[PDB]
Amino acid sequence: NQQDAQINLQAVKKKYKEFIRTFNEENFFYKYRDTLKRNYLNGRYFLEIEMEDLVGFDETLADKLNKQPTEHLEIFEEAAREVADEITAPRPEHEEHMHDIQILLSANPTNIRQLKSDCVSKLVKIAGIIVAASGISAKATRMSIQCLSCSTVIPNLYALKCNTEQAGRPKCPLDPFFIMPDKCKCVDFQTLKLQELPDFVPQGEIPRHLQLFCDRSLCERVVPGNRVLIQGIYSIRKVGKEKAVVGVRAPYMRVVGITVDSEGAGAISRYTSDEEEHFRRMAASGDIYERLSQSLAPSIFGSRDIKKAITCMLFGGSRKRLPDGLCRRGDINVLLLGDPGTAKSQLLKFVEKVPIAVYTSGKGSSTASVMKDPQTRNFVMEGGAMVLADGGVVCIDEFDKMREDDRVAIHEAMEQQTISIAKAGITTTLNSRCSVLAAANSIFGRWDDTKGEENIDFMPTILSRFDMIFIVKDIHDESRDITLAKHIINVHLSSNKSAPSEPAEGEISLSTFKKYIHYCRTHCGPRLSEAPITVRQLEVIRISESLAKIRLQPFATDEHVNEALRLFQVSTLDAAM
Amino acid sequence: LGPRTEIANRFQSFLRTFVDERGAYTYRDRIRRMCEQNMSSFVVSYTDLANKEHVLAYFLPEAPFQMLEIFDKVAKDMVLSIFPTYERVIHVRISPLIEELRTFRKLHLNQLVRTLGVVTATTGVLPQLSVIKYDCVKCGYVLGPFVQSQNTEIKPGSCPECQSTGPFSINMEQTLYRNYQKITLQESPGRIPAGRIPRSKDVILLADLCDQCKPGDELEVTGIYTNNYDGSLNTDQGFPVFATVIIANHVVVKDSKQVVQSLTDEDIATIQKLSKDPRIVERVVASMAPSIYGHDYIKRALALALFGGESKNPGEKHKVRGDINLLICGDPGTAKSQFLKYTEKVAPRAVFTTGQGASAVGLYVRRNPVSREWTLEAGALVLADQGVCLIDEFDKMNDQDRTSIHEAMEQQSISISKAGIVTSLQARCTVIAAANPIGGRYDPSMTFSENVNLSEPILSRFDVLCVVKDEFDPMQDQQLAKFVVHSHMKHHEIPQDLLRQYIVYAKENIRPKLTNIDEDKIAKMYAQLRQESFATGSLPITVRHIESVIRMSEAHARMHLRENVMEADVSMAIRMMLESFIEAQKFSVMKKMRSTFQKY
Amino acid sequence: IRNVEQQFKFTNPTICRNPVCSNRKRFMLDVEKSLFLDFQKIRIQETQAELPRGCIPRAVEIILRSELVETVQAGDRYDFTGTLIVVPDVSVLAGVGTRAENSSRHKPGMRELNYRMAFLACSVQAT
DNA sequence: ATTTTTTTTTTTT
Ligand SMILES: Nc1ncnc2c1ncn2[C@@H]1O[C@H](COP(=O)(O)OP(=O)(O)OP(=O)(O)O)[C@@H](O)[C@H]1O
Numbered sequence A: 001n002q003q004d005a006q007i008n009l010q011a012v013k014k015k016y017k018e019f020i021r022t023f024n025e026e027n028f029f030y031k032y033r034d035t036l037k038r039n040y041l042n043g044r045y046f047l048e049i050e051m052e053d054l055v056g057f058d059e060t061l062a063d064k065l066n067k068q069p070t071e072h073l074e075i076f077e078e079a080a081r082e083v084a085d086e087i088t089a090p091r092p093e094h095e096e097h098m099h100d101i102q103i104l105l106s107a108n109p110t111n112i113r114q115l116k117s118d119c120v121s122k123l124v125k126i127a128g129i130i131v132a133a134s135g136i137s138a139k140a141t142r143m144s145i146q147c148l149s150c151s152t153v154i155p156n157l158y159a160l161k162c163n164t165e166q167a168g169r170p171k172c173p174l175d176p177f178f179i180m181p182d183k184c185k186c187v188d189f190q191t192l193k194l195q196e197l198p199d200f201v202p203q204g205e206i207p208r209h210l211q212l213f214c215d216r217s218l219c220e221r222v223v224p225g226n227r228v229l230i231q232g233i234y235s236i237r238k239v240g241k242e243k244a245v246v247g248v249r250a251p252y253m254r255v256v257g258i259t260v261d262s263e264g265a266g267a268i269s270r271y272t273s274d275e276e277e278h279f280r281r282m283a284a285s286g287d288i289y290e291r292l293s294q295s296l297a298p299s300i301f302g303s304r305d306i307k308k309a310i311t312c313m314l315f316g317g318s319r320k321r322l323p324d325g326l327c328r329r330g331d332i333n334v335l336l337l338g339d340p341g342t343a344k345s346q347l348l349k350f351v352e353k354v355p356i357a358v359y360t361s362g363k364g365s366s367t368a369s370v371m372k373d374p375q376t377r378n379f380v381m382e383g384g385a386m387v388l389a390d391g392g393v394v395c396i397d398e399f400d401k402m403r404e405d406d407r408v409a410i411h412e413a414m415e416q417q418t419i420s421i422a423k424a425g426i427t428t429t430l431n432s433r434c435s436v437l438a439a440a441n442s443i444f445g446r447w448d449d450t451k452g453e454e455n456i457d458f459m460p461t462i463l464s465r466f467d468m469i470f471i472v473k474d475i476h477d478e479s480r481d482i483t484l485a486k487h488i489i490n491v492h493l494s495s496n497k498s499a500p501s502e503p504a505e506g507e508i509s510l511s512t513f514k515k516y517i518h519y520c521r522t523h524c525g526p527r528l529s530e531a532p533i534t535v536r537q538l539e540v541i542r543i544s545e546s547l548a549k550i551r552l553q554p555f556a557t558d559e560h561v562n563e564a565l566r567l568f569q570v571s572t573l574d575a576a577m
Numbered sequence B: 001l002g003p004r005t006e007i008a009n010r011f012q013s014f015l016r017t018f019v020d021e022r023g024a025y026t027y028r029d030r031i032r033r034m035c036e037q038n039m040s041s042f043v044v045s046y047t048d049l050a051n052k053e054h055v056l057a058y059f060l061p062e063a064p065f066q067m068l069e070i071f072d073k074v075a076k077d078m079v080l081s082i083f084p085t086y087e088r089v090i091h092v093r094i095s096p097l098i099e100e101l102r103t104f105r106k107l108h109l110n111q112l113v114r115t116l117g118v119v120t121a122t123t124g125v126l127p128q129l130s131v132i133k134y135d136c137v138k139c140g141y142v143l144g145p146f147v148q149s150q151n152t153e154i155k156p157g158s159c160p161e162c163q164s165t166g167p168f169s170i171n172m173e174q175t176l177y178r179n180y181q182k183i184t185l186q187e188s189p190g191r192i193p194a195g196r197i198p199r200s201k202d203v204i205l206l207a208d209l210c211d212q213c214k215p216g217d218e219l220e221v222t223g224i225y226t227n228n229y230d231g232s233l234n235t236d237q238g239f240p241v242f243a244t245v246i247i248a249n250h251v252v253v254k255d256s257k258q259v260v261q262s263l264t265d266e267d268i269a270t271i272q273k274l275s276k277d278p279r280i281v282e283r284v285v286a287s288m289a290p291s292i293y294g295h296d297y298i299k300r301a302l303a304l305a306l307f308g309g310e311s312k313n314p315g316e317k318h319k320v321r322g323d324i325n326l327l328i329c330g331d332p333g334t335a336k337s338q339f340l341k342y343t344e345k346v347a348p349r350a351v352f353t354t355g356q357g358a359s360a361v362g363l364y365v366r367r368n369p370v371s372r373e374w375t376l377e378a379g380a381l382v383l384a385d386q387g388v389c390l391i392d393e394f395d396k397m398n399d400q401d402r403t404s405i406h407e408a409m410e411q412q413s414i415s416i417s418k419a420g421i422v423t424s425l426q427a428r429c430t431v432i433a434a435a436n437p438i439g440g441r442y443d444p445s446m447t448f449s450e451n452v453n454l455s456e457p458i459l460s461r462f463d464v465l466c467v468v469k470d471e472f473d474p475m476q477d478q479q480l481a482k483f484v485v486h487s488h489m490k491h492h493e494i495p496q497d498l499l500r501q502y503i504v505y506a507k508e509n510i511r512p513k514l515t516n517i518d519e520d521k522i523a524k525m526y527a528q529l530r531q532e533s534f535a536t537g538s539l540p541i542t543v544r545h546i547e548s549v550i551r552m553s554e555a556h557a558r559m560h561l562r563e564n565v566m567e568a569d570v571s572m573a574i575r576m577m578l579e580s581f582i583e584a585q586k587f588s589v590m591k592k593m594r595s596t597f598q599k600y
Numbered sequence C: 001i002r003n004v005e006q007q008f009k010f011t012n013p014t015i016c017r018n019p020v021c022s023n024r025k026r027f028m029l030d031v032e033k034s035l036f037l038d039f040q041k042i043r044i045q046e047t048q049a050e051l052p053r054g055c056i057p058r059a060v061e062i063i064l065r066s067e068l069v070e071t072v073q074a075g076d077r078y079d080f081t082g083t084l085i086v087v088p089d090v091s092v093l094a095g096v097g098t099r100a101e102n103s104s105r106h107k108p109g110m111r112e113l114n115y116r117m118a119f120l121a122c123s124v125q126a127t
Numbered sequence D: 001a002t003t004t005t006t007t008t009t010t011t012t013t
């Protein structure tokens, strides 16, 4: 025992354990102590702390632990397994066996463009935006071997005398150490990665980054697309002095005390009955079908009676399967078409926020990702976007102005959901409850639309599987042409229109509306009542069943709900003749 | 060493006593300036060194490395003897006589050197070492050799951990680093000795001299010539595999696209008192391109493409556009040859490329480590932050090259999909092109999209135009043979080096915004022309028929610093559009003449 | 060591000078107060005043010393010095002639040898 | 054997 300084016991000698028992004040709740006892409500096997109680206790240890932190934390492992195991039993009647835990630390941040040898082996707060990282494989700490039969005591998370020798004379040097892993221990890993900030010249420079090391409990916690504050360690991996013209080496860090950002109102993504009153006692009003014809364009005029046909769209129809095979097309889609200038871009762009979707078109997902990664050259996939749309739907332009490769998967999803693969020798036959809104700047507008059928030069199929195709124009109406000539200076100027539609009776509140829907589309198996008009006009019946869930009713009739019929007469005049 | 006795004394004799320029020499204050700047890069000029002791030129380059260390130690011994205060938290610089590329040689190794180069694509940033700690395997006591050690071994069985530990251990801690990023060299296309071998060589920088370089851009260096630590030493092939390495001491700008005038300040007033009024559409324009006679149209034309790029985000929609866009159809025979020269010297950002045969397919992202031969290259779009791509013979390029360019005009950006990494590239840039037509050399008032065949979704993004059909006009041709002789008889307003002050200030200060001043007129140019200019060649009216006008009528007034506007300079710019737009339509054309001569 | 270590048949690690030292260990030393060269490299095809049936102007390879360097350009006629010498190879492919070594005999990875030709020069006259 | 590339053929309305 080296009782001069750097003393090897102090912490577990008495100090930190007992400070923790000094973490003990009146209200009889001032504790970092029964924290684990509420972890033992489940056996989470970890605990949280600060770095500003030790400051509230002393000014002596905070500059001390920073030298040997990753030593202190397994010192704390020892502290715990000595302490709580005292608490596993008052008097001699309880202990099955001990176990192991982790500790979580946490104040004020830093950046990355300032940190080097000067601040090495030092614990820091910084922030970026995550990119991607690995899964979880494996680790352990100890086991033993035939050759000596001693535990594989390792400090850090070389390779040895034989000791299969003392049988009289015989030696056996040169290392016959054959590990017996059934004797072993075990830990976790992820090996993480992130990119530095988006505000600190990532443009004229390139973004630098960090490599990381997860341990026990902290994987399955973090997916990229996030923004975090963390602590780590400033360490490297190689040893030294035609690479390295003299001595060059590589950067990384560790994991310690992540604390993430959960910024406010994004996260009904990852992580009341009064609101149900708001749902229903508003739903009792029979004023929602055509009321919201001034809603989905909270800043635009037009599409009014076509917003009348969105009212059925997202609510969906019904996948009324049968005793025999089918799972027919409950899902429903739309088509729109016309020239630029009608703001149909912004119509889809602003719609992004209004359940799950993406808005890109042509040459810039698609199909599968049957490629490799870095890690022992695996081949593992990413799927399609029926993957990413199975109740979520999409709004996507430029069918025609996109590669002709990824067009067998259009009929292989809109008609049947008859999806399949053959890249490697197999049919991953995934499926999904998908639907789509379509837009285009296709050939020659209303001069083409009203008359016959020549829009796409490969198929007439695109009028069959969809129904509601209402034209986009830049019609000349001189009374409104000047308005739309000055419907574009208020848009062009002054940055005012954030929530101008908020005052409206019930044609706003994005969150409540999305939740309106995402309850509504999970009520029951609604239907209708007893009650060129050909087979795919009729196969509109989806909209018939829709008004059950639009009035949030079970049932409805044909011709009160032929509102849809009278709205479809907008489309049928395009391709009646 | 012995002579270093004198050197330190001779240094300390000048860094705070030798003075020019009427006292208080900077060095007495430079130290503390950088000290309060947390910067640590004390700079020197060899001129003043030479003024002190010209003996400082020839005991130096027996080893220029000792000069810099001997200077760094005077620094340390001056810093904390006076500022022991901030001792708990150096290198120096010199920056003056030029030597040339391919003149450093066999003989110019490791001496006093002053040398130049240019940048291109290279690697990221990384750290290096200084210090020897390895031991702890037997006893592993604290031993502590007394230096940070670069390439030094003793390896005893006796070393103070009970003079033991012939075997070995290694540390991964308590370990100094120093960032570093690699270069790529280039040499100028101005100072060409006619197509000799293209310059690229191993050259180096260091931690503080880092994170500043950019491709195809230049920076003058002090520099000193050395070689790689070991260039392929074994009884081997009929040549050694040798390269040679240069390393940076001070980096000194060659470009200065920013403010360029250091301690010109006498002529600076002539810019804003002569390029500020609405007459400057004649003053600044008389000198617009006074080279040859024809086509004063293009003088007015090209003067305003040079001018802008902006956020001014409208209401909550997105970023809308910040770019310029030009294109012409001519015939070689036209005087269209010099298509990119001068205002790109005005341009703070831009990069050149002639036509297909030499057009960029780069216009492809992975991420690697660096073993031997690891590089990748592609499009210049980060570059050209309000810069230009300077081109002739554009019509041959690749549709997918045009994809980025259409996206640059559409969403101010490009959009990668289905790749390993999906990194991006933002497009705040400008474009110039000089293609040739289909079926010949020019097709008449018959349609223009098929006069030269670009495609549908691409050209709608493009903005500026100038077109030359040209029949004969004689007096100017006799003037032009007179111009031939007298221009071949060089027997041997805004000031010329200050016009750039206009790109600095004009676009900078006044950025007017307006309500609809009379812009229901453009409701007419919508609707009337949807009924007037109907079927001759007569589609082309869009939002960019006016959004382009915001792009450039504003430039036309921004020339003036008006700050508030009626229709005057706006439609004077649309006097380009009365001139530019008319060009694309059938000889039943004067629907524009009727419909705009009031807007003329 | 002001000796002649400039060979292709060269070794930086050598044995000793005065005492007995190792036979693999090495220092690295004064590459700074010393004497050097500079050179370049080309290829060249057969002449056109000489043109035979069948055969073609094959390519042949040279390094030349410094004061001749970069004083040339495509398209000239010469009377060089053609002092042909061989490769001191490092490894060979399809060089399956004798495979051997200067290895002592036996009593109480290796190297191989197959070369190819080159040329060299000392003097020029563009004609 | 793969990574970073380029043409010269292989076969054409
Ligand atoms: N109006 C004019 N003013 C002055 N010079 C003219 C005029 N018209 C014709 N020329 C002469 O005609 C010649 C045309 O050929 P030129 O060298 O311009 O081809 P080019 O335009 O450079 O081809 P490209 O632009 O595609 O590279 C010019 O050298 C120019 O001197």
Ligand SMILES: Nc1ncnc2c1ncn2[C@@H]1O[C@H](COP(=O)(O)OP(=O)(O)O)[C@@H](O)[C@H]1O
Pocket (backbone or CB within 6 Å): A300, A301, A339, A340, A341, A342, A343, A344, A345, A346, A347, A441, A484, A487, A488, A491, A492, B320, B543
């Ligand atoms: N009624 C309107 N209100 C606001 N902006 C409009 C209106 N009509 C047209 N616009 C303009 O149209 C532009 C967008 O056109 P866009 O939707 O991109 O065409 P496309 O959808 O074919 O790409 C916007 O910049 C906007 O200023």
